[PDB]
Amino acid sequence: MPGTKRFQHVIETPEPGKWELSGYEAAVPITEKSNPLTQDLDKADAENIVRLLGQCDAEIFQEEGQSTYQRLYSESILTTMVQVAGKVQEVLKEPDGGLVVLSGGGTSGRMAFLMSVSFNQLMKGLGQKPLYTYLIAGGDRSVVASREGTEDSALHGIEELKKVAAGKKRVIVIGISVGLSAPFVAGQMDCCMNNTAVFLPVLVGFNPVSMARNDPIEDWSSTFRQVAERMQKMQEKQKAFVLNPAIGPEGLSGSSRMKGGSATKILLETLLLAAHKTVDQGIAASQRCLLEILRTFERAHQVTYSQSPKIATLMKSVSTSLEKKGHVYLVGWQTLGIIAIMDGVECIHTFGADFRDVRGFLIFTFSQEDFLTSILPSLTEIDTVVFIFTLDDNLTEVQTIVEQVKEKTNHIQALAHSTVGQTLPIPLKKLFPSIISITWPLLFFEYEGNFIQKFQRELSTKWVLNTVSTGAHVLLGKILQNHMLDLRISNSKLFWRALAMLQRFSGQSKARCIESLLRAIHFPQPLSDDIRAAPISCHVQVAHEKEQVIPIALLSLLFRCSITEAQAHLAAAPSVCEAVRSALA
Template sequence: MPSTKRFQHVIETPKPGEWELSGYEAAMPITEKSNPLTRDLDKADAGKIVQLLGQCDAEIFQEEGQAMPAYQRLYSESVLTTMLQVAGKVQEVLKEPDEGLVVLSGGGTSGRMAFLMSVSFNQLMTGLGQKPLYTYLIAGGDRSVVASREGKEDSALHGIEELKKVAAGKKRVIVIGISAGLSAPFVAGQMDYCMDNTAVFLPVLVGFNPVNMARNDPIEDWSSTFRQVAERMQKMQEKQEAFVLNPAVGPEGLSGSSRMKGGSTTKILLETLLLAAHKTVDRGIAASPRCLLEILRTFERAHKVTYSQSSKIATLMKQVSTSLEKKGRVHLVGWQNLGIIAIMDGVECIHTFGADFRDIRGFLIGDHSDMFNQKAELTNQGPQFTFSQEDFLTSILPSLREIDTVIFIFTLDDNLTEVQTLVEQVKEKTSNIQALVHSTVGQSLPAPLKKLFPSIISIMWPLLFFEYEGNFVQKFQRELSTKWVLNTVSTGAHVLLGKILQNHMLDLHIGNSKLFWRALALLQRFSGQSKALCIESLLQAIHFPQPLTDEIRAAPISSHIQVAREKKQVIPVALVSLLSRCSIPTAQARVAAAPSVCEAVRNALAGPGRKRGAEPLEASRPAVQ
């Protein structure tokens, strides 16, 4: 499938792929499809995993193909035009900041990205002597930034209540709602509320599915589906009373794992349009397509620079996998905003891979007093909510073991004396230390610090001659680069541990309605059984040892999710039960006896009498309330 490239690119993007064909997994939205590039991800070694995930990340920058349907992409004229229109609306608020506000909102990864970007742009404004204009909302509040609380995004009313609080007294509020799959009720409610109150609010929806693929299931506490909300926004976009920014960037390298491309594209898209707004507002001119393209190319360059370190990324992946295999812990210790990226990566492993919160954890070194809306929410909340420098020194450092791995993430502009002191303290406990270091041409790591690390991923950036706002481009590049490295390492480590079947997360934690439906789709895909049988098996695995009654079967999805949150290995157990036609206790025993959850499923797939292949996934949802 040829593509007609209109722009000069920094990197070579993959050619338009099989996933763009109209018949490919037709019932699935793009963000839930499996990526043909990675269909054998579970058979890949560390080097190949880095290569494949790097190719998937490069798909972000693809232009439109000539396949039908032709999905709009990041570089499509329609997307660039909408970005400029939104940038213009942001400029209007920047010109009258006293009565205005820009709210970035989302659940899970999207909410953490909202947090990161609001912190960044408030730092930019403070540095210019301007009053900070940004705030963030994340489903479940500040605790969801540093801990996995994915279920909080299922309430539309919760989203509206939180929005009303932060917008009180403001006369012009731009609300940028982020939902990679166009699926989170938390965001849907906010967008609907904004459309009902356009005198004050301007809603901007960001996601990576076409609107006709937005989630269409009923929302338990709201009258509209997400798709209906998005369709209404499209109509209002004609009058610039709402905007939808939804370029397709292809399926995730790990099916449905929107923490990866979804999170990265959110950062690229919004930082590009917001930075363009800030760069041009003082000159009294509108942001231009050229300005957008210049910034987008710097993010392409970040991809090239990052994946030039592929062999060292693969080495780090193997080290992390070895620590986890030995029941060790992995600690990601990042300075300043790179610490936020570290926290995000660790938290997201919990629901993505069914990991324990202690397996991979991020820590932020540096002052974070002005970052959070409600810092009190994070005080004395227990070990799951520890993330600060003090937490690392008091809770982690004393108990470090040789089987643990600690990764230090910093730039050569950080306090290197502080870095060296902490590295020396850690090295007394474990020799498994690694560094991810960002520098600019002309900078070099001091020899005493360099010799402390057995291995260093050193990423050097070219000098950029920009005005103050433009200097943030390099900051954003470093953050994105760090995200790509950590996502690739933590994902690859779990692939090597046998947590992935083909390119599917088999042991994900069912923490919200999106993940419930994904679990059901996995059972259908690999068992080939009817929807009714798959629902029955899933509910049995969730509620065991309680027998399934008609009352339980008829309960709303939220009640099943509430029980599932406390359970482990629900999907592998349900799948083995389906494939082997055995009871839940027998399936649990088989999963426990296998070297990994995927081996347990492979054994069941290879069992006698197994029907080969799975029936196509149907578009309609099963009749679960």
């Protein structure tokens, strides 16, 4: 029948209590899983949430039990990281005609950018021509925009690769898809394997290859799975590499911006920093060199969540300011300002939040007195502002902006990253009673700009912010158990998550779930055969423009009613959360 191909590969819903014995649970990609720790994240109070996420973040460093999937500390992952570092080095020793590209969609692309800058600086501060560049699905404006739909084209990915790789004779392409998912990277990786004489692709994400996305790509003949499998085959002969540790499911199912984003930095910063450090010392990179860095990153998790109680407060605030339809500002300096922006803009697609509910700010790029005029007038008693800076920053520029905002707001708090024995000028101190400071024990730093203290600082911030924004929204009832049900479908991945959530939550058959979801999307049009057989982009295109789609489809299924009857129910409820929740009992 119409729509069998389109949906052949979707796993059928299990009968009740079979979910584990059907073989389904074991088929759920790790990146999409329900993390058992967060089953009741929707009941947790603010301080628990922080524990829970802090604990979810911990899993990055958790070791492989005795049978199971390789992890970040496993010998095979470290051996691959060493080989890849080894291959970076061949390129480092020959900067003329060489290039290194870090490429991904969404937050994977955000990470690629942050990184590529730093390693450009490293080389620059040593007067070397920088060989790093990045690629973000949707071109460079994607870096700081919510643009979920751009990831779904493999040709786009390839065209942007060919742009950036024109003159060159040695290109290393680090393809980054947490889920081993994005058609953007799929194309690049494949392009590479077509031209190894020039190209060396390194796939990075956090599912085993056997869970890699197997869906038809609309402009491409192979799947991510096939590309990823072919890479793995080239790995013996060292012409491609797959770097894919399990780090455990996200605390918020499918939210790869969080642990997936962190692990991406932890993993690549490590390998690259080691690759550099060691060329200059004339030694081959070693499992022992990477391990230094990994353990430092692991310490940083302890250091960061050491401040858990002051993280929870800031959450309790960010949520209360949002509860009262107020706004939240995330002002920060340098690299940290950027992480501030990236997080605010991620709450758009993640939580169907307006660009303003969590806004981020660099000194988006508004310098001192441009932020005093432009933004400072229209704040309020109820808003929250967060300040994020090191004790190495223009702390004069800081105290100035905090001063004005104290009159216009009292719900300020702050994040400051200090080396040990660095002191907090007394004006600032008195402005923040219950401050959050992180002190970094001294480290025997090699290079010019102390990059390892950079990578530390960025990560620690991302953790805090990811945790705040994310838990804030939870406190507000927008999350259902540990799933975000009411997402805007803006690409094919999101479309599949929507459908898997309908199966999980209704527990009805896939065919019924598909029909209700596609009805929900296409309303007022009824299911025709064209619609049933349409490619997934066409559903996306139409859903992307609509509101409450997934909830309305779930309700149609629950009451076993039509869309018309489900809309009219949802309009007659106080809220969406409540309506869905009621219907689920």
